[PDB]
Design a protein around this nucleic acid. Structure first.
Lengths: 48, 114, 54, 161, 93, 100, 55, 31, 29, 56
RNA sequence: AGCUCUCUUUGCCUUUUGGCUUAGAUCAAGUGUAGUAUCUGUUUAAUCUCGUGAUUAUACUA
C-alpha cells in the first residue's frame, strides 16, 4: 500500500539482472518445438 | 504454438473400401426382426377425425379425473413461536430453469459441503 | 495494389509514441484493439497516464 | 459485442454449465458410494465442488449486503440482553488486553509456536510460505520479547489483513 | 528475503509483466520480479497499481461517507471499502 | 509534433464531447410568480412617482452551524461508541453529542 | 450535378456490400476507358453491314 | 549512490528495449 | 540518450518524449 | 476548466467567493481547484499548456 | 470542372491471438568446478594481330 520508491543513480546487481531478464522474457514468445523448427529450417538451408 | 488446435474442417464420411472378404468386423447378433403382433398396435390406423376424437376423449377423461368428475418452563425463554410459518412449505413444487438455484442443487451442496 | 502494399508497410513501420508490443503481429493486434476498444477505455487510459483516479 | 452473438454465447455457456454440474453431481454420488477409485476423477470433482461452493458463497454474501442483516434489531437486542444478564449473574470479569509484563506471556507464546510447528511436523516438501513460517517460528523462539511486542502491536493496530 | 519496499523498477516490471501475463498468472509475474512472492505481486496490483484506485486527496463527501459507514459496520473494512470507493487500507488510514 | 497534436486534439475533443456531464441547478428561491408581484409592485411605485411628478447591498453565504459539523459530530460519536470498554464493568457512557 | 456527384461519392466511400463495390468498380473502369471511338465503331458497323448483306 | 535517478524506467521503455533486442539457378537440374 | 529513453519518466512522473514534444510544439507555435 | 489555461476564470470564481461566501466555501473552492489540477495532470494537457505558455 | 506528381482526411485490417480439463499441474534459490566463446583497456612514341607478345627511340647514374 505504500507508494513506489524512486530508482537510485546506481542500481544494484539484483536490479540489473532483473531488468535484463525482464527484457528477455518479454521478448520471448515461442515454445521448444517452434524454436527447433526454426533452427532446423536454417540447418536444412545450409546443408542444402 | 499451433500444435494444439481446434477443428474447422471435420472429417467427411467415406464410401466403404471394396475388396475380398477376410477381416471379420461385426459378429451376427439379433438377426431376426420383431414385428408388431395382434394387440401391439402400430399397423392400426383409424382415421384423422377418429384419432382426434379419441384424443379429446382421453384428454377430457384425464381432466375430469383430476377435477373429480364421476411460572412455566416454556415461558422463562426469550424467543417464542419462532417456527411458525416454516412447516407450511410444500404447496407446489416449482421447476426452476437455473440449475445452481434449484432446490436439488441447494440440497446437494448442503449435504456434501460441510 | 503493390504500391499501396508498400505504402501501408512503411506507415505501419513508423512508430508514434509508446511501444506496447513485442513483435509485428502484436503491433497489428494492438492497433486493431485501439481501433475497436478505445471508445470504451478512455477513463482507464487517463488513469494509467496520470497515475490515479478511477 | 453484437447482441445476437452475445445471446448465442450465453445460451451455450449455460448449456455447458448444465452438463458440467450434472457430471459434478454424478461423480460425487459415485465417490460417496465408493463406486469409483479413480484418483483423477476425485481431484477433478473436488475442484468442481470448490468452484460451485464459492459461487454459492459469493451469492450468499451478495444477498446479505442486499437484503440486510437477517437478524432483526429486536432479535439482536434480545440476544445481547440475555448475554449481559447472564454474565452479570455469573459476575464475569472481562478479559484484559495482555500486559507488557504479563507473567505468563512466554508460556502462552511457546504453546502457540509449538502448535504451529506441529502443524509442520510431518512435512517432506515445503513451499515458500511454509519455509517462511518455519523461519518466523524459529525467530519467535530466539526473540520471544520482540515477538510479543510485535504481536501486541498488531492486536492494537491492525484491522485489515 | 521475499518482501520489503516496492521500488519503481519493481512496479514497472510488474506492469509490463501484467501486460504480458494478465492478472491470473502471478507466479509467472513474480518469476520476473524475483524479490517478491506471487501473493505480494497480487497484493501490490490490488492495493496500489490497479488503475481504479484513487490516490487523490479525500473529498468531504468521501470523508462523511467513510465515517458514517465505519459507525454502521464497525471494523469491517473489507466490507466498508467498496461502498466508500477506496481501498480497505486507504479507508482505514 | 504539429500533426500529431492535431490528431491528438481531435481525439481529445471527441473524448470531451462525450465526457461532458449535465448541470444540476438549485431551485431558485424567488420563482416566477413572486417575480410577477414584485414587478407589479415596482411598476406601481414608479407610476405613483410618475403621477406625483406629473401632477444590505451585498449578500453573503451563511455559515453552517458548528453543531451541524456532521464530520466532527461523527468523530466524537465514533469515539463515544468505540473506545468504551465492556458494559459489565459499569462505567460512564460518554455523551453522544448528536444535535441535528 | 458535379457537387451532388462528389457528395454521393463521399457518402458511398464506406463499405456496404459487394454489389455496391462491384457497381463502383465498373463505373470507375468505364470512366478510365473514357470516350469510345465512334469513328472506329462506325467503321466496324459499316463493315458488318456489308458483310451481313453479303451473307 | 542512493540519490534518486533523473530518469525513471517505465514498462513501455522495457517493451521498446525488448523489441530492440528482438537463388541463382545455373541448370535445369537445380531448377 | 533522452531520445533513446523517451518513454521513461522524470521525477515528476512525466515522459521525456512528452517534455520534448511540448518544447517542439512551443517552437512550432 | 483547467487552471493552468483558465487563470481569469479561477480569478473570477475567487472574486465571487470573496464577495459572497465564507472560508468553508473558499476551502471547498480550493479543494475543487486542486482536484481539477490532479485530473488535468496528464501528458496531453501538459503538451497543450506548455504550448500555450510559450505561445503567450 | 482535364490528366500526372505530392500532402491530408475518409475508407479498407490488409502477417494481426486456430481446441479441451483439476486457472491441466507444480514452482525461493545459491554455490563450486570444468570447458568454450566474449570484452573494459626507367620514361615516352608509333605499328599489326590474337591489351599482351613483337617492332621500338631513349632517360637516369661522383
Amino acid at each position: 500500500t505504500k507508494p513506489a520508491r524512486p530508482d537510485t543513480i546506481d542500481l544494484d546487481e539484483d536490479e540489473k539482472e532483473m531488468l535484463s531478464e525482464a527484457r528477455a522474457r518479454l521478448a520471448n514468445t515461442q515454445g521448444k518445438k517452434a524454436k527447433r523448427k526454426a533452427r532446423e529450417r536454417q540447418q536444412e538451408e545450409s546443408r542444402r | 504454438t499451433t500444435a494444439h488446435r481446434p477443428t474447422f474442417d471435420p472429417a467427411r464420411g467415406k464410401e466403404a473400401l471394396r475388396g475380398p472378404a477376410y477381416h471379420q468386423r461385426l459378429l451376427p447378433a439379433y438377426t431376426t426382426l420383431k414385428f408388431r403382433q395382434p394387440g401391439q398396435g402400430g399397423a392400426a390406423d383409424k382415421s384423422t377425425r377418429d384419432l382426434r376424437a379419441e384424443l379429446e376423449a382421453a384428454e377430457a377423461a384425464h381432466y375430469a379425473k383430476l377435477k373429480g368428475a364421476p411460572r412455566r418452563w416454556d415461558e422463562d425463554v426469550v424467543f417464542k413461536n419462532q417456527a411458525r410459518g416454516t412447516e407450511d412449505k410444500g404447496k407446489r413444487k416449482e421447476f426452476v430453469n437455473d440449475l445452481l438455484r434449484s432446490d436439488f442443487h441447494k440440497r446437494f451442496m448442503s449435504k456434501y459441503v460441510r | 495494389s503493390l504500391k499501396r502494399r508498400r505504402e501501408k508497410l512503411a506507415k505501419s513501420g513508423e512508430e508514434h509514441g509508446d511501444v506496447t508490443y513485442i513483435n509485428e503481429k502484436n503491433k497489428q493486434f494492438n492497433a486493431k484493439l485501439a481501433r475497436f476498444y478505445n471508445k470504451y477505455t478512455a477513463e482507464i487510459r487517463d488513469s494509467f497516464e496520470r497515475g490515479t483516479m478511477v | 459485442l453484437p447482441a445476437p452473438i452475445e445471446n448465442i454465447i450465453l445460451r451455450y455457456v449455460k448449456a455447458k454449465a448444465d452438463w458440467w454440474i450434472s457430471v459434478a453431481h454424478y461423480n460425487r454420488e459415485r465417490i460417496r458410494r465408493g463406486a469409483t477409485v479413480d484418483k483423477t476423477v476425485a481431484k477433478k470433482n473436488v475442484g468442481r465442488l470448490t468452484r460451485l461452493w464459492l459461487k454459492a458463497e459469493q451469492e450468499r454474501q451478495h444477498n446479505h449486503m442486499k437484503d440486510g442483516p437477517y437478524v432483526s434489531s429486536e432479535e439482536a437486542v434480545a440476544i445481547y440482553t440475555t448475554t449481559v444478564h447472564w454474565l452479570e449473574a455469573r459476575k464475569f470479569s472481562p478479559i484484559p488486553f495482555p500486559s507488557v509484563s504479563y507473567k505468563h506471556d512466554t508460556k502462552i507464546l511457546i504453546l502457540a509456536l509449538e502448535r504451529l510447528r506441529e502443524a509442520y511436523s510431518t512435512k517432506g516438501r515445503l513451499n515458500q510460505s511454509q519455509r517462511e513460517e518455519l523461519a518466523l517460528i524459529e525467530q519467535a523462539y530466539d526473540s520471544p520479547g520482540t515477538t510479543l511486542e510485535r504481536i501486541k502491536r498488531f492486536l492494537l493496530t491492525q484491522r485489515a489483513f | 528475503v521475499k518482501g520489503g519496499v516496492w521500488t519503481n523498477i519493481e512496479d514497472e516490471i510488474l506492469k509490463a509483466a501484467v501486460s504480458k501475463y494478465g492478472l491470473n498468472q502471478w507466479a509467472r509475474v513474480s518469476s520476473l520480479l524475483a524479490r517478491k512472492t506471487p501473493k505480494q505481486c497480487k497484493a501490490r496490483w490490488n492495493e496500489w497499481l490497479d488503475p481504479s484506485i484513487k490516490k487523490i486527496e479525500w473529498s468531504r463527501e468521501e470523508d462523511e461517507k467513510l465515517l458514517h459507514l465505519a459507525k454502521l459496520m464497525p471494523t469491517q473494512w473489507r466490507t466498508i471499502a467498496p461502498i466508500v470507493g477506496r481501498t480497505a487500507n486507504q479507508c482505514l488510514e | 509534433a504539429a500533426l500529431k497534436a492535431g490528431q491528438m486534439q481531435k481525439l481529445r475533443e471527441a473524448e470531451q464531447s462525450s465526457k461532458r456531464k449535465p448541470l444540476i441547478l438549485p431551485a431558485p428561491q424567488v420563482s416566477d410568480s413572486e417575480l410577477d408581484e414584485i414587478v407589479k409592485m415596482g411598476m406601481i411605485g414608479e407610476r405613483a412617482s410618475a403621477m406625483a411628478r406629473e401632477s444590505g447591498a451585498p449578500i453573503r453565504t451563511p455559515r453552517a452551524p458548528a453543531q451541524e459539523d456532521h464530520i466532527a459530530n461523527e468523530i466524537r460519536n465514533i469515539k463515544a461508541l468505540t473506545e468504551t470498554q465492556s458494559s459489565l464493568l459499569g462505567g460512564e457512557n460518554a455523551p453522544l453529542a448528536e444535535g441535528a | 450535378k458535379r457537387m451532388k456527384k462528389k457528395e454521393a461519392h463521399r457518402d458511398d466511400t464506406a463499405f456496404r456490400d459487394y454489389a455496391r463495390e462491384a457497381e463502383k468498380t465498373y463505373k470507375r473502369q468505364i470512366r478510365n476507358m473514357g470516350a469510345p471511338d465512334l469513328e472506329k465503331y462506325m467503321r466496324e458497323k459499316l463493315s458488318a453491314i456489308e458483310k451481313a448483306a453479303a451473307a | 549512490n542512493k540519490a534518486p535517478a533523473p530518469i525513471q524506467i517505465s514498462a513501455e521503455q522495457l517493451l521498446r528495449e525488448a523489441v530492440d533486442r528482438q537463388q541463382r539457378f545455373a541448370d535445369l537440374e537445380e531448377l | 540518450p533522452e531520445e533513446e529513453q523517451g518513454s521513461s519518466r522524470n521525477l515528476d512522473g512525466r515522459r521525456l518524449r512528452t517534455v520534448t514534444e511540448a518544447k517542439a510544439l512551443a517552437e512550432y507555435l | 476548466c483547467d487552471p493552468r489555461t483558465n487563470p481569469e476564470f479561477w480569478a473570477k470564481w475567487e472574486q465571487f467567493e470573496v464577495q459572497h461566501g465564507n472560508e468553508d466555501t473558499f476551502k471547498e473552492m480550493l479543494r475543487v481547484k486542486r482536484s481539477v489540477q490532479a485530473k488535468y495532470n496528464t501528458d496531453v494537457n501538459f503538451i497543450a499548456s506548455q504550448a500555450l505558455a510559450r505561445s503567450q
